[PDB]
Amino acid sequence: SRIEPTNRAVLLPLGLTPEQVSQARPMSRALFDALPVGPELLVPEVPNAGGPATFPGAPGPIGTVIVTPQISGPQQYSLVLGDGVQTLPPLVAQILQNAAGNTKPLTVEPSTLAKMPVVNRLDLSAYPDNPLEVVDIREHPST
């Protein structure tokens, strides 16, 4: 999956550094063809951000982020889609929380959030669960 050096918004949550991105070692043309391609590691774009929602009871316009606490376990983050909401993992939410944007998401009650319709339309496959454990090539010269 492709990455860029200037995009502090995606590097900072992921744990990468611009130097560590620009100074990486070369790769053979043969290995580059064997590996299947993933999407760009970029801030996931939301279509028609700021528009009105299709469903009743929506806490806000398209592209806004909503969060609800729990009695136990972590807080459940979510984003407003055109036809509903989709739950997002913490690391994905941290990407969106960086542009400036709002200082905090819309806080809401668990029951109303459970009553709203859930949709799945934005791809999360490329983003991980925790900061990446980047292998230091000087000690591991082969892949």
Added chain:
Amino acid sequence: SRIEPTNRAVLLPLGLTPEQVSQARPMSRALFDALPVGPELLVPEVPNAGGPATFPGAPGPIGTVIVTPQISGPQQYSLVLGDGVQTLPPLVAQILQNAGSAGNTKPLTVEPSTLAKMPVVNRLDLSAYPDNPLEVVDIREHPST
């Protein structure tokens, strides 16, 4: 590598103590010649310190330490040079603050959106220092090397 007992700014972050260093045991001439010499453990000499930056929007004078807020992910320290900023390892940032204190005790906190505009530059060598505290061996239990 050489180190001096008067430089409290470097002894403390590494995990050394002035008395401990002064009471170190002898070394034979035979072993002194065998070991290769490495660069000295001293405070990094940042060039042209204190002047204004060339690039726009610089958060402070050349040589100030910058950090980013913890809410946006693991904190990355950096140094502002004349033409841009270069990253710093955690252990070295502590030495620059302690030595370059002159009464100041903390860095300037800046957000990612304003940080991303600053150009990246690499103009000083910093690979000598380790990335974590020194596990100094208590010589009474290991008198041979």
